[model samples]
Target: MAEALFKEIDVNGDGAVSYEEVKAFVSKKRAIKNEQLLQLIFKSIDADGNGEIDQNEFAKFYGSIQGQDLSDDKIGLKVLYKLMDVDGDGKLTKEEVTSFFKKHGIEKVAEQVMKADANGDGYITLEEFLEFSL
Candidate 1:
């Protein structure tokens, strides 16, 4: 099922799905309605940072999400941490979260903050973000 979905998105026969491709695929299938957030999710899945998602990365991501077992490799932990950490501060603040998602007109900022800031320190660390990534 993951292979078929990947094939449908890798429209140019490149053997990999680019950011735009995943964004389109996710937007339609998940009804996310936020291109920026979709891009962020794609970046997280694209572990190699080559601006595209190859088969292995996609497979790992698919299996993790499907199996409900989020692993570092499966979730692109490093990339997601960097992307969400915005300022490279190694921590994610509610303000940053709200600011980033607001650009996409997403109103779940508070909910996200509540979920990610597990320590209640008013900021989300990489560990905390990992908990929320899945």
Candidate 2:
């Protein structure tokens, strides 16, 4: 099933999907992203070393893409990294992130918040931010 989806965008039959193909495909899907960011994301999500993304791969990749981040994991984390920070502590303890999310009108999925808090220090660092690569 996923193979058929990949074939629609494989265009050149190179068995690899290029950024150009992805952009064209995504544009058709009405997806949007910063050009540079999209390129970076495409490079990051092609995890199989095949350069081509099948449905499962594209699903995961798209899930990671902010456009398809149903749980708002990426934007939510980015927001937490920006706002909801009172003391510039540079880490979001569970409470801090929860409070931040609530304050910013995000009121669900505390679990995701927890997952984003990788250090278990009740806080999140830029390291986590970079490492998680969300």
Candidate 3:
């Protein structure tokens, strides 16, 4: 699935995927905000600083998000928190999370937010986001 996903995003067949490619691919089904998120993921996964995500780098990034540490260091959860906090409120609402995950056609937005909203405050703070990422 990962290989197929990578190939679908690597439209130019350059053996790697670029932020532009990701942005374009994501834009086909979602909005510009989703494009930015893809760029953020691309930047995080392009570990060699080569401006592209190869198979190994993609695997590492995918693993990191899936509770595996395929790399020596993990991509900082705080970075993702900051990126996803679109309202600059230092926290996340269901709407925000919905916007973020909507790109993937994920419909369980409320379930996800409830799982991460440890305090039941109707919002996910940075601390809670960090905890949930773990």
Top candidate, metric TM-score: 1
lDDT score at residue 35, model 3, on the 0-100 scale: 65
How good is model 1 by TM-score? 0.41
Query: How many residue pairs clash per model?
Result: 0, 2, 0
Off by over 4 Å in 1: 63-134
What Cα-based lDDT does every candidate model obtain? 0.69, 0.64, 0.69
* C-alpha RMSD between model 3 and the true structure: 13.4
RMSD to native for every prediction? 13.2, 10.7, 13.4
Off by over 4 Å in 3: 60-134
| Residue 107's lDDT in candidate 2 | 55
For candidate 1, what is the total of clashing residue pairs? 0
Q: Candidate 2 regions off by >4 Å?
A: 46-59, 64-68, 71-134
Candidate number of the best lDDT: 1
Question: Which 10-residue window in model 3 sums to the lowest lDDT?
Answer: 68-77
